Amino acid sequence: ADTNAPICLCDEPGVLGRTQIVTTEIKDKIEKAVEAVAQESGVSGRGFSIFSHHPVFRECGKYECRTVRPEHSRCYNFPPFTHFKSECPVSTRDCEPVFGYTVAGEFRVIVQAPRAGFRQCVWQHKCRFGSNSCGYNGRCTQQRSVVRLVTYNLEKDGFLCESFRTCCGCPCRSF
Amino acid sequence: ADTNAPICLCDEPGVLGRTQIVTTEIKDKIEKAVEAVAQESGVSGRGFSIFSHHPVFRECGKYECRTVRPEHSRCYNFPPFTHFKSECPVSTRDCEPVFGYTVAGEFRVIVQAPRAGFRQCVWQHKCRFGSNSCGYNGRCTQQRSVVRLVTYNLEKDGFLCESFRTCCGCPCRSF
């Protein structure tokens, strides 16, 4: 594999920040579209409920930044739901990405519309010091899982659920 | 009177995982307060922090463990930023304090929330062998400096910056 990389949400070498800067015009388009969704609802204007009528949001739009805690994205909370015997120290950061590369490696725009009231978050848990030695013979390794998040299709002006790899833990594996 | 063994951030058997009064009851309260900031903040970027949108954190949240280097707490990194002519031998230890005494002598809980992505580190540089003769007429002296760290005010259960003395070096104080 020449160019190979799993790529976790918010992954970035320079202190894990932003790679490129999405056009404000795009953010504008998204805000508008999300507002359109909220209005086609109207009823139940108390919270996320304004989005709960649209099929895609119902399917994968529930990683609400307001409710998602870090433990919800630890590997033990994703199938197979098992705990690590030994896990290395973990660096945890909330992630609210505007872009992501799917499981298939494609580039996608992940929907974030703070003004409209729709924000998606998934806390990332990575090996604190990369892959250092840890067992009596082990190695610190990044484990991942997969989350589905609402993305925005620029062409067809439509929403869609897509799969992204998320960093859930750092088990000390025997290499 | 003088003392060969100076007192620094992380000194005395009180600073530990459990620690003095820093009950798992307090710890948890702090963790959730930090998570709330992460959840409402969201704002992030390279060479930044997700906490830089909150006023207390933008002011004194820069001793985050992932960015801190041992030399960042050496005396020459604090005003008047001057180097020593002769410095006695130093013992450098990492320090991630859970409580401390402010420059005004008050006890304060120093925020440490590993699970929400906020840890504070200030490496202590102590006189390896204190007070012993070093120069012609000098005596090895613990040099302290002042650092501001995010604290948790019990009363108003919120965040506040406070000033703490930190051990930055051990100059041979001759004359």
Short mmCIF file of all heavy atoms in Angstrom, two decimals, chain B residues 44-85:
data_model
loop_
_atom_site.label_atom_id
_atom_site.label_comp_id
_atom_site.label_asym_id
_atom_site.label_seq_id
_atom_site.Cartn_x
_atom_site.Cartn_y
_atom_site.Cartn_z
N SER B 44 -11.96 25.26 17.80
CA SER B 44 -10.63 24.67 17.88
C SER B 44 -9.82 24.96 16.62
O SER B 44 -10.34 25.52 15.65
CB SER B 44 -10.74 23.16 18.12
OG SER B 44 -11.78 22.60 17.33
N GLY B 45 -8.54 24.60 16.66
CA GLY B 45 -7.66 24.81 15.52
C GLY B 45 -6.25 24.37 15.87
O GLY B 45 -5.99 23.99 17.01
N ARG B 46 -5.35 24.40 14.89
CA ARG B 46 -3.96 24.00 15.12
C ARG B 46 -3.23 25.04 15.96
O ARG B 46 -3.45 26.24 15.78
CB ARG B 46 -3.24 23.78 13.79
CG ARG B 46 -3.18 25.01 12.89
CD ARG B 46 -2.32 24.77 11.65
NE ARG B 46 -2.90 23.78 10.74
CZ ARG B 46 -2.56 22.49 10.70
NH1 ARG B 46 -1.65 22.01 11.54
NH2 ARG B 46 -3.15 21.68 9.83
N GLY B 47 -2.38 24.58 16.87
CA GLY B 47 -1.64 25.49 17.73
C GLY B 47 -2.60 26.36 18.52
O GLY B 47 -2.41 27.56 18.67
N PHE B 48 -3.64 25.71 19.05
CA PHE B 48 -4.69 26.39 19.81
C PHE B 48 -5.16 25.43 20.92
O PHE B 48 -4.36 24.65 21.48
CB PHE B 48 -5.87 26.67 18.86
CG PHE B 48 -6.43 28.06 18.98
CD1 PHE B 48 -5.90 29.10 18.22
CD2 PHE B 48 -7.50 28.32 19.83
CE1 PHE B 48 -6.42 30.40 18.29
CE2 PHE B 48 -8.03 29.61 19.91
CZ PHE B 48 -7.49 30.65 19.14
N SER B 49 -6.45 25.50 21.21
CA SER B 49 -7.11 24.65 22.20
C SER B 49 -8.61 24.89 22.02
O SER B 49 -9.04 25.94 21.50
CB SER B 49 -6.70 25.01 23.64
OG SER B 49 -7.37 24.17 24.57
N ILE B 50 -9.39 23.89 22.40
CA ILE B 50 -10.83 23.98 22.30
C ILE B 50 -11.30 24.86 23.46
O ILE B 50 -12.37 25.45 23.41
CB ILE B 50 -11.48 22.54 22.28
CG1 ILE B 50 -13.01 22.60 22.27
CG2 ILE B 50 -10.99 21.70 23.43
CD1 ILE B 50 -13.68 21.22 22.11
N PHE B 51 -10.43 25.06 24.44
CA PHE B 51 -10.77 25.86 25.61
C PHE B 51 -10.50 27.37 25.49
O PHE B 51 -10.94 28.15 26.33
CB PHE B 51 -10.09 25.27 26.85
CG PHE B 51 -10.47 23.84 27.11
CD1 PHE B 51 -9.63 22.81 26.72
CD2 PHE B 51 -11.69 23.52 27.65
CE1 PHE B 51 -10.02 21.50 26.86
CE2 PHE B 51 -12.08 22.20 27.78
CZ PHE B 51 -11.25 21.20 27.39
N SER B 52 -9.86 27.77 24.39
CA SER B 52 -9.50 29.18 24.11
C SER B 52 -10.69 30.14 23.81
O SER B 52 -10.49 31.32 23.49
CB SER B 52 -8.50 29.22 22.95
OG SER B 52 -7.44 28.29 23.12
N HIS B 53 -11.91 29.61 23.87
CA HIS B 53 -13.14 30.35 23.63
C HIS B 53 -13.73 30.79 24.98
O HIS B 53 -14.63 31.64 25.03
CB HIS B 53 -14.08 29.41 22.85
CG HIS B 53 -15.54 29.72 22.96
ND1 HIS B 53 -16.43 28.92 23.66
CD2 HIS B 53 -16.30 30.69 22.38
CE1 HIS B 53 -17.66 29.38 23.49
NE2 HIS B 53 -17.61 30.45 22.72
N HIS B 54 -13.22 30.22 26.06
CA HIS B 54 -13.66 30.50 27.43
C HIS B 54 -12.62 31.44 27.99
O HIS B 54 -11.43 31.15 27.92
CB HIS B 54 -13.68 29.18 28.22
CG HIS B 54 -14.18 29.31 29.63
ND1 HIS B 54 -13.39 29.78 30.66
CD2 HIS B 54 -15.35 28.94 30.19
CE1 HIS B 54 -14.05 29.68 31.80
NE2 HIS B 54 -15.25 29.18 31.54
N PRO B 55 -13.04 32.56 28.60
CA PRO B 55 -12.17 33.59 29.19
C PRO B 55 -11.15 33.16 30.26
O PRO B 55 -10.02 33.64 30.25
CB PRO B 55 -13.16 34.62 29.71
CG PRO B 55 -14.36 33.80 30.04
CD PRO B 55 -14.46 32.87 28.85
N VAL B 56 -11.53 32.29 31.19
CA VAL B 56 -10.54 31.85 32.16
C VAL B 56 -9.44 31.04 31.44
O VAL B 56 -8.25 31.30 31.60
CB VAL B 56 -11.16 31.00 33.26
CG1 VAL B 56 -10.08 30.46 34.18
CG2 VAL B 56 -12.13 31.84 34.06
N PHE B 57 -9.86 30.11 30.59
CA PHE B 57 -8.91 29.28 29.86
C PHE B 57 -8.04 30.05 28.87
O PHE B 57 -6.86 29.73 28.73
CB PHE B 57 -9.60 28.09 29.17
CG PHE B 57 -10.19 27.08 30.12
CD1 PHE B 57 -11.47 27.24 30.63
CD2 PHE B 57 -9.46 25.94 30.48
CE1 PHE B 57 -12.03 26.28 31.49
CE2 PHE B 57 -10.01 24.97 31.35
CZ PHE B 57 -11.30 25.14 31.85
N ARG B 58 -8.60 31.02 28.16
CA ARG B 58 -7.78 31.77 27.23
C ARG B 58 -6.66 32.53 27.98
O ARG B 58 -5.56 32.71 27.45
CB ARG B 58 -8.61 32.70 26.37
CG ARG B 58 -7.76 33.59 25.46
CD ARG B 58 -6.74 32.80 24.61
NE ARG B 58 -7.37 32.12 23.48
CZ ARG B 58 -7.74 32.71 22.34
NH1 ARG B 58 -7.52 34.02 22.17
NH2 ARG B 58 -8.40 32.03 21.41
N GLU B 59 -6.94 32.94 29.21
CA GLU B 59 -5.97 33.64 30.03
C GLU B 59 -4.88 32.73 30.63
O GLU B 59 -3.70 32.91 30.34
CB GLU B 59 -6.67 34.39 31.16
CG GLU B 59 -5.69 35.11 32.08
CD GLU B 59 -6.32 35.76 33.31
OE1 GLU B 59 -7.56 35.87 33.44
OE2 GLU B 59 -5.54 36.14 34.20
N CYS B 60 -5.27 31.74 31.42
CA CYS B 60 -4.28 30.88 32.04
C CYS B 60 -4.30 29.37 31.74
O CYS B 60 -3.83 28.58 32.54
CB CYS B 60 -4.29 31.09 33.56
SG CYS B 60 -5.84 30.60 34.37
N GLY B 61 -4.84 28.98 30.59
CA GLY B 61 -4.87 27.57 30.27
C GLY B 61 -3.75 27.14 29.37
O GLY B 61 -3.88 26.16 28.64
N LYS B 62 -2.62 27.81 29.42
CA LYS B 62 -1.53 27.46 28.51
C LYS B 62 -0.47 26.47 29.01
O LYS B 62 0.55 26.28 28.33
CB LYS B 62 -0.87 28.71 27.96
CG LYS B 62 -1.83 29.65 27.27
CD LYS B 62 -1.92 30.97 28.03
CE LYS B 62 -2.63 32.07 27.21
NZ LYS B 62 -2.67 33.40 27.90
N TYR B 63 -0.66 25.90 30.20
CA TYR B 63 0.29 24.89 30.71
C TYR B 63 -0.29 23.51 30.55
O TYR B 63 -0.14 22.65 31.42
CB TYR B 63 0.72 25.15 32.16
CG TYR B 63 1.73 26.26 32.21
CD1 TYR B 63 1.33 27.60 32.23
CD2 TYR B 63 3.08 25.98 32.13
CE1 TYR B 63 2.25 28.61 32.18
CE2 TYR B 63 4.02 27.00 32.07
CZ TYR B 63 3.58 28.29 32.09
OH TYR B 63 4.50 29.27 32.05
N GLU B 64 -1.03 23.33 29.47
CA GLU B 64 -1.61 22.06 29.12
C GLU B 64 -0.47 21.04 28.95
O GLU B 64 0.50 21.32 28.25
CB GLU B 64 -2.40 22.21 27.84
CG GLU B 64 -3.58 23.09 28.01
CD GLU B 64 -4.54 23.02 26.84
OE1 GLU B 64 -4.09 23.23 25.69
OE2 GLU B 64 -5.74 22.76 27.06
N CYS B 65 -0.60 19.87 29.57
CA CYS B 65 0.46 18.84 29.51
C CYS B 65 1.00 18.45 28.17
O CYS B 65 2.20 18.19 28.07
CB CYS B 65 0.08 17.57 30.24
SG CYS B 65 -0.16 17.81 32.00
N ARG B 66 0.15 18.37 27.15
CA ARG B 66 0.63 18.00 25.82
C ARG B 66 1.55 19.02 25.15
O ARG B 66 2.35 18.64 24.29
CB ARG B 66 -0.51 17.56 24.88
CG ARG B 66 -1.79 18.40 24.85
CD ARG B 66 -2.89 17.67 23.97
NE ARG B 66 -4.26 18.20 24.13
CZ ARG B 66 -5.32 17.49 24.52
NH1 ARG B 66 -5.21 16.20 24.80
NH2 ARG B 66 -6.48 18.10 24.72
N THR B 67 1.51 20.28 25.57
CA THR B 67 2.34 21.27 24.93
C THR B 67 3.55 21.67 25.77
O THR B 67 4.50 22.27 25.26
CB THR B 67 1.54 22.55 24.62
OG1 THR B 67 1.23 23.26 25.83
CG2 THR B 67 0.26 22.21 23.91
N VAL B 68 3.48 21.39 27.06
CA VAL B 68 4.54 21.77 27.99
C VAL B 68 5.82 20.98 27.87
O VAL B 68 5.78 19.77 27.71
CB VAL B 68 4.00 21.72 29.45
CG1 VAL B 68 5.12 21.67 30.46
CG2 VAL B 68 3.12 22.93 29.69
N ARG B 69 6.94 21.70 27.91
CA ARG B 69 8.28 21.10 27.85
C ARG B 69 8.94 21.45 29.18
O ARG B 69 8.56 22.42 29.83
CB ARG B 69 9.09 21.65 26.69
CG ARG B 69 8.67 21.10 25.36
CD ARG B 69 9.85 21.05 24.40
NE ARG B 69 9.45 21.48 23.06
CZ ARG B 69 9.76 22.66 22.52
NH1 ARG B 69 10.57 23.49 23.17
NH2 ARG B 69 9.32 22.96 21.31
N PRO B 70 9.91 20.64 29.62
CA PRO B 70 10.56 20.94 30.89
C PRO B 70 11.18 22.33 30.99
O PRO B 70 11.06 23.01 32.01
CB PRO B 70 11.63 19.83 30.99
CG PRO B 70 11.03 18.72 30.24
CD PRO B 70 10.45 19.40 29.05
N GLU B 71 11.83 22.76 29.93
CA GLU B 71 12.50 24.05 29.90
C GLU B 71 11.57 25.26 29.91
O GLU B 71 11.98 26.37 30.19
CB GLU B 71 13.42 24.10 28.69
CG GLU B 71 12.68 23.96 27.37
CD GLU B 71 12.49 22.53 26.88
OE1 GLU B 71 12.57 21.57 27.69
OE2 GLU B 71 12.25 22.37 25.65
N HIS B 72 10.29 25.04 29.64
CA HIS B 72 9.33 26.15 29.64
C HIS B 72 9.15 26.67 31.04
O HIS B 72 8.56 27.73 31.19
CB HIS B 72 7.94 25.74 29.13
CG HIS B 72 7.90 25.34 27.69
ND1 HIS B 72 8.92 25.63 26.80
CD2 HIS B 72 6.96 24.68 26.98
CE1 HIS B 72 8.60 25.16 25.60
NE2 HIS B 72 7.42 24.57 25.69
N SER B 73 9.53 25.89 32.07
CA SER B 73 9.38 26.36 33.43
C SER B 73 10.70 26.71 34.10
O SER B 73 10.76 26.87 35.32
CB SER B 73 8.56 25.40 34.29
OG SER B 73 9.13 24.10 34.22
N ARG B 74 11.76 26.80 33.31
CA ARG B 74 13.08 27.22 33.81
C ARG B 74 12.99 28.74 34.07
O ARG B 74 12.28 29.46 33.35
CB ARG B 74 14.15 26.93 32.75
CG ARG B 74 14.35 25.45 32.55
CD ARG B 74 14.99 24.85 33.80
NE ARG B 74 16.45 24.90 33.67
CZ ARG B 74 17.29 25.37 34.59
NH1 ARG B 74 16.86 25.92 35.73
NH2 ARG B 74 18.58 25.35 34.31
N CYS B 75 13.71 29.22 35.07
CA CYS B 75 13.66 30.65 35.41
C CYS B 75 13.88 31.61 34.23
O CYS B 75 13.24 32.66 34.17
CB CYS B 75 14.67 31.00 36.48
SG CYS B 75 14.65 29.97 37.95
N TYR B 76 14.75 31.27 33.29
CA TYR B 76 14.96 32.18 32.17
C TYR B 76 13.75 32.35 31.26
O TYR B 76 13.82 33.10 30.29
CB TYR B 76 16.19 31.77 31.35
CG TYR B 76 16.17 30.37 30.81
CD1 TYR B 76 15.34 30.02 29.76
CD2 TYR B 76 16.96 29.38 31.39
CE1 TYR B 76 15.29 28.71 29.29
CE2 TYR B 76 16.92 28.08 30.92
CZ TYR B 76 16.09 27.75 29.87
OH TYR B 76 16.05 26.47 29.41
N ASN B 77 12.67 31.60 31.54
CA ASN B 77 11.43 31.70 30.77
C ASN B 77 10.37 32.52 31.47
O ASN B 77 9.22 32.49 31.07
CB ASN B 77 10.85 30.33 30.45
CG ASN B 77 11.32 29.79 29.11
OD1 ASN B 77 11.35 28.58 28.90
ND2 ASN B 77 11.71 30.69 28.20
N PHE B 78 10.76 33.16 32.57
CA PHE B 78 9.86 34.01 33.35
C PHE B 78 10.61 35.31 33.47
O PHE B 78 11.84 35.33 33.42
CB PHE B 78 9.66 33.45 34.76
CG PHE B 78 8.89 32.16 34.80
CD1 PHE B 78 9.55 30.93 34.73
CD2 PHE B 78 7.51 32.16 34.95
CE1 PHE B 78 8.85 29.72 34.81
CE2 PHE B 78 6.78 30.94 35.04
CZ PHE B 78 7.45 29.73 34.96
N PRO B 79 9.88 36.43 33.54
CA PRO B 79 10.54 37.74 33.67
C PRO B 79 11.42 37.77 34.92
O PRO B 79 11.05 37.25 35.97
CB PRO B 79 9.36 38.72 33.78
CG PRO B 79 8.17 37.83 34.20
CD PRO B 79 8.42 36.55 33.44
N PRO B 80 12.58 38.43 34.85
CA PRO B 80 13.20 39.18 33.75
C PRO B 80 13.93 38.37 32.70
O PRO B 80 14.91 38.86 32.13
CB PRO B 80 14.20 40.06 34.49
CG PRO B 80 14.76 39.09 35.52
CD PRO B 80 13.47 38.43 36.04
N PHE B 81 13.53 37.12 32.50
CA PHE B 81 14.13 36.27 31.47
C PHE B 81 15.65 36.29 31.46
O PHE B 81 16.27 36.44 30.40
CB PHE B 81 13.62 36.67 30.06
CG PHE B 81 12.13 36.79 29.96
CD1 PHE B 81 11.50 38.02 30.22
CD2 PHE B 81 11.33 35.68 29.65
CE1 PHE B 81 10.12 38.14 30.17
CE2 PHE B 81 9.95 35.79 29.60
CZ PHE B 81 9.34 37.02 29.86
N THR B 82 16.28 36.16 32.61
CA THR B 82 17.74 36.17 32.58
C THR B 82 18.30 34.81 32.93
O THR B 82 17.67 34.05 33.67
CB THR B 82 18.34 37.24 33.52
OG1 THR B 82 17.60 38.47 33.41
CG2 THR B 82 19.79 37.50 33.14
N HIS B 83 19.45 34.51 32.32
CA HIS B 83 20.18 33.26 32.53
C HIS B 83 21.10 33.41 33.73
O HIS B 83 21.40 34.54 34.11
CB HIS B 83 20.99 32.92 31.29
CG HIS B 83 20.16 32.39 30.17
ND1 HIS B 83 19.33 33.19 29.41
CD2 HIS B 83 19.99 31.13 29.71
CE1 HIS B 83 18.69 32.45 28.53
NE2 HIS B 83 19.07 31.19 28.69
N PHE B 84 21.48 32.30 34.35
CA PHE B 84 22.38 32.34 35.52
C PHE B 84 23.87 32.22 35.13
O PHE B 84 24.21 31.64 34.10
CB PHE B 84 22.02 31.21 36.51
CG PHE B 84 20.67 31.34 37.16
CD1 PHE B 84 19.88 30.21 37.40
CD2 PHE B 84 20.19 32.59 37.58
CE1 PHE B 84 18.64 30.31 38.04
CE2 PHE B 84 18.95 32.70 38.22
CZ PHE B 84 18.17 31.55 38.44
N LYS B 85 24.75 32.82 35.93
CA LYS B 85 26.19 32.71 35.68
C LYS B 85 26.60 31.32 36.12
O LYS B 85 27.25 30.60 35.38
CB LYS B 85 26.98 33.77 36.47
CG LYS B 85 28.26 33.27 37.18
CD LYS B 85 29.39 32.91 36.22
CE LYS B 85 30.45 32.06 36.91
NZ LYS B 85 31.50 31.55 35.98
#
